Amino acid sequence: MKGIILSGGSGTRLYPLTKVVSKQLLPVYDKPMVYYPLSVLMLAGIKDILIISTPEDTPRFEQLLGGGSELGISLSYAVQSSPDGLAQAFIIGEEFIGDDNVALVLGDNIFYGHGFTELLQRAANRKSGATIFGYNVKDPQRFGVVEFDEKGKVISIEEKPEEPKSSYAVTGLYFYDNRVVDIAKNITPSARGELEITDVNKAYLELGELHVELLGRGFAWLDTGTHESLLQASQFIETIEKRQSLKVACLEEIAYRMGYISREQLIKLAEPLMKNEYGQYLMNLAHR
């Protein structure tokens, strides 16, 4: 499976933070925001990944992450000339996707919880249909909202409904089979002027092929869309990492743990970083 990170947009709410930095280049505690959705695609077993951003920001992501060889993966880049909708990812990424299935993750989403790696690899290995991930939230009108059965069967899906049909947000992580490219070409802009991922999911729902996994109250799903929520997410990660010997979304660690790179290769990455705690972390891991 291939994966795309949609890592553009204006980040208007975070102004002036986003006047000269992409929202997805801002810190979440100790690492750039984009590390977090990238880690999710890596843990799903996805090694061929396209990162989409604005004309100004795309080369900044490429500066940060490179072509992926350090992580035993392939990273490519594409520009989105205007933030015209999530569904544009599959239009921009058409040549990249080819005939393959593809996962999409939103650049400003932070997922964390027990059992997630297993859940990801399951979804990544499903060959047909769309898999979306629901989460019970306080203000469901702020999100795509999914309404489902006692058996977990989807009934409806709506983008930012004024009257939400349930409390379950549709989070920014989606797994699709190859139909999604032609689906995305056939949707049209909503009232917000955007080619909506919710309309991609509606197409699968019409076919009876939209499948929801509920993440559960024990899972953390945050986004960094406001100054307050960005700061809370940073605090959340700090609290986790302080207690444990372990980092969240440490890309080099994940590359090693997923078998994408060797112990020796991890040492080589750790060497030029031994001057900081991050390199020290990687080196301790290599020597375990």
Ligand X SMILES: Cc1cn([C@H]2C[C@H](O)[C@@H](COP(=O)(O)OP(=O)(O)O[C@H]3O[C@H](CO)[C@@H](O)[C@H](O)[C@H]3O)O2)c(=O)[nH]c1=O
Task: Compare residues 151 and 185 and give the one whose CB is closer to ligand X.
Answer: 185
Query: Is residue 195 exposed (0-12), middle (13-18) or buried (19+ Cβ within 10 Å)?
Result: buried
* Closest distance of CB 256 from ligand X, Å: 8
Residues 6+ apart with CB under 8 A from 104: 3, 4, 6, 86, 89, 90, 172, 173, 174, 175, 176, 197
Specify the amino acid at residue 276. N
Q: Return d(Cα 84, Cα 8) in angstroms, integer.
A: 10
Minimal CA–CA distance to 65: which of 83, 41, 85, 89?
41
* Closest distance of CB 99 from ligand X, Å: 24
Which residue's Cβ lies closest to ligand X? 144
| φ, ψ (nearest 5 deg) of residue 70 | -55, -30
Residue 175's H or E segment, with its range, is: strand 168-176
- What are the distances in angstroms from CA 25 to CA 37, 59, 71, 106, 155? 12, 12, 19, 13, 37
Task: Compare residues 93 and 172 and give the one whose CB is closer to ligand X.
Answer: 172
DSSP bridge pairs for 3:
49, 103
* Closest distance of CB 243 from ligand X, Å: 13
Task: Compare residues 101 and 144 and give the one whose CB is closer to ligand X.
Answer: 144
Spatial contact of 157 and 145, defined as CB atoms under 8 Å apart: yes
* Closest distance of CB 29 from ligand X, Å: 13
Task: Compare residues 20 and 150 and give the one whose CB is closer to ligand X.
Answer: 20
Judge whether 263 is annotated as a binding position: no
Task: Compare residues 244 and 276 and give the one whose CB is closer to ligand X.
Answer: 244
Task: Compare residues 151 and 243 and give the one whose CB is closer to ligand X.
Answer: 243
In sign, the C-alpha dihedral spanning 46, 52, 57, 60 is: positive
Specify the amino acid at residue 280. Q
* Closest distance of CB 234 from ligand X, Å: 15
Q: Return d(Cα 17, Cα 87) in angstroms, integer.
A: 26
Minimal CA–CA distance to 45: which of 210, 255, 221, 215?
255
Residue numbers at the binding site for ligand X (CB under 6 A): 6-9, 24, 39, 43, 80, 83-86, 88, 106-109, 112-118, 143-144, 159, 169-172, 194, 196-198, 223, 225, 248-249, 253-254, 257
* Closest distance of CB 3 from ligand X, Å: 14
Judge whether 58 is annotated as a binding position: no
Judge whether 13 is annotated as a binding position: yes
Spatial contact of 12 and 111, defined as CB atoms under 8 Å apart: no
Judge whether 193 is annotated as a binding position: no
Judge whether 107 is annotated as a binding position: no
Judge whether 216 is annotated as a binding position: no
Judge whether 147 is annotated as a binding position: no
* Closest distance of CB 27 from ligand X, Å: 15
Judge whether 115 is annotated as a binding position: yes
Judge whether 131 is annotated as a binding position: no
Task: Compare residues 109 and 234 and give the one whose CB is closer to ligand X.
Answer: 109
Known binding positions for UTP: 113-117, 249, 253
Residues making up the binding site for UDP-alpha-D-galactose:
8, 80, 85, 108, 144, 159-160, 170, 192
